[PDB]
Amino acid sequence: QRRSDFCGQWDTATAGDFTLYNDLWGESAGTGSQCTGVDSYSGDTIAWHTSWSWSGGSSSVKSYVNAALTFTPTQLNCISSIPTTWKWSYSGSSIVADVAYDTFLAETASGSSKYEIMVWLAALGGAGPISSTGSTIATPTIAGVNWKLYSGPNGDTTVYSFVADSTTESFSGDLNDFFTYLVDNEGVSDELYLTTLEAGTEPFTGSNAKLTVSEYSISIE
Incomplete structure (x- = not known):
């Protein structure tokens, strides 16, 4: 833990067009704490990083510390990449825990x-996504990863949760390929507005943990 970190439930920091949210929304489901800090912003x-220890509420997410992009909500139709x-x-x-992008689509901006x-770039320690059946609905290859x-x-x-077959510590690609996949294969309307682009971690339980994000960038064209 650094004295420069922020540990409050709804604390934020700003860097460029990012907001780094602590968002310790599931705080009450367990015992522990979580502190977060920006390390650099270049170009x-x-x-950034976030450190935590969480115990209890084994199936309950304790937080989603994430870097969120500020952008104008845009219809999937109008996104090039x-x-x-x-x-x-x-x-x-x-x-x-997981390491995951979290995005949302709505009928209006x-x-x-x-x-x-x-x-999900990582599903650690048996962490698993929301699933109606408990089994996959598809196993596509997108952005150099098998999902x-x-x-x-x-x-x-x-x-919808795309979960990488293997932990992926270095990821790059066009995130729109995931939306295009669901538009083409799962009946998602391409007239819907992309409202949210977040990248962070959902911890369940663990001790003396730290996510180090050495590089993160995202933009919409």
Whole structure:
């Protein structure tokens, strides 16, 4: 833990067009704490970290510390690409957590989400996504990675989660390829607005853990 870190439930920091949210929303489901800090911002690339220990509520996400892009909500129709690079590593013991993009689609620019679309670069310690059946709905290769695609409900929002077959500490590609996949193969409307582009980690449980994000960038064209 650094004295420069922020550890409050809803604390934020800003770097370029990113907001780094602590978003310790599942705090009450366990015992522990989580502190977060920006390390650098160079060009359009952010580097940051978050350290935590969480125990109890084994199946309950404790937080989603994430870097979120500020952008104008745009219809999938109007997106040419979403180039992104993400380099990270995890330290700690008994880590049950994911490292994932979290994105949302709505019928209007500032509307309620019809879909949540996740891209998991890591599923650590048995962490698993929302799934109606408990099995994949597809196993596509996208952005140089072999994925296991799952779907499941969260009330009025459908959650799609692409989970990498292997932990991917260095990822790069066009994130729009995932939206294009779902438009072509899972009946997602390309008239929907992309409202949210986030990249972070969901911890369940673990001790003396730290996500180091050495490089992250994303933009919409």
